[PDB]
Design a protein around this nucleic acid. Structure first.
Ligand SMILES: Nc1ncnc2c1ncn2[C@@H]1O[C@H](COP(=O)(O)OP(=O)(O)O)[C@@H](O)[C@H]1O
Ligand SMILES: [Mg+2]
Length: 255
DNA sequence: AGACGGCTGGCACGACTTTTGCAATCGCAGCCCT
């Protein structure tokens, strides 16, 4: 499919579950830490999914405000629209039969929440008069980094609607918990950045870098992975000289 | 007897008017161009 970061037993099982869900057009949930890219994984699995070649929706959550699905997802394609009349494309109508991914869906308001709840209850929220229904055939996807478990417990979203929006919630475990893909990512990023930073060679994570990583809590995980990647890009040293002090923390004050 | 008067209107600038000067996107689908 695509070049992938992480082939661990957990990562491999994730790939297997992705294959299982790929036929499953029923909406599901892939949970994980941000700065990893589970959305890209969803895109690859969608290429493997029912829509082997189909549409795709990015749909960052807080990209629409005071803009209903009717404003953007449904659109104003027909005549007699607001202002002077013309054609206007709509997302949720545009990408039927493809992929419908919701980015940072945990970042959500109550009103859009009530909208999407009915959209799920009816297949799509539809437009205008209450006599008009709709359904969307795109592969519905969504993800964020928040444990909604308490958000619904706090009522930030409708708990029943939360239950409705998916059919199988899956959570990506911490890469820091893995801490084995540490070396694999280090090497892959070393090659990629040697191609990028145009270095003579990859310095290689010397003993101190490995020890620090072993001690590192790595809160950002894949986010912290790219963070350490940039950090070592700062701490290049020499292409020959293996990087023992590879990490570079911006917050710290040297000397 | 040359200067006032008041007429006159030209000279000018803002305030009410006011004609005109603007036509389309839909709707399939079929027929025509490819
Ligand atoms: N398996 C992977 N292979 C290559 N790159 C990855 C992998 N997982 C994560 N990444 C990197 O992490 C980033 C995650 O981006 P994105 O999915 O947009 O985050 P979010 O879903 O929080 O917006 C991507 O830019 C990608 O380069
Ligand atoms: Mg994103």
């Amino acid at each position: 499919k695509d070049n992938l970061l992480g082939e661990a037993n957990s990562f491999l099982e994730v790939l297997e579950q992705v294959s299982h869900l790929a036929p499953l057009d029923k909406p599901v949930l892939i949970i994980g830490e941000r700065g990893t890219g589970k959305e890209l994984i969803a895109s690859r699995l969608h290429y493997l999914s029912s829509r082997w070649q189909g549409p795709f929706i990015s749909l960052n959550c807080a990209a629409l405000n005071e803009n209903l699905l009717d404003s953007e997802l449904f659109g104003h394609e027909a005549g007699a629209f607001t202002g002077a009349q013309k054609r206007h494309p709509g997302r949720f109508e545009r990408a039927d039969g493809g992929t419908l991914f919701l980015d940072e869906l945990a970042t959500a308001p109550m009103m859009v929440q009530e909208k999407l709840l009915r959209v799920i209850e009816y297949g799509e929220l539809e437009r205008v008069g209450g006599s008009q229904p709709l359904q969307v055939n795109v592969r519905l996807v969504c993800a964020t980094n928040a444990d909604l478990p308490a958000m619904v417990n706090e009522g930030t979203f409708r708990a029943d609607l939360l239950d409705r929006l998916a059919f199988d919630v899956v959570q990506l475990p911490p890469l820091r918990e893995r801490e084995s893909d540490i070396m694999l990512m280090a090497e892959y990023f070393a090659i990629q950045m040697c191609r990028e930073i145009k270095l003579p060679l990859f310095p290689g994570f010397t003993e101190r870098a490995r020890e620090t990583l072993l001690n590192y809590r790595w809160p950002g995980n894949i986010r912290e992975l790219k963070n350490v990647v940039e950090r070592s890009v700062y701490r290049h040293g020499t292409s020959d000289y293996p990087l023992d002090d590879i990490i570079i923390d911006p917050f710290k004050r040297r000397p």
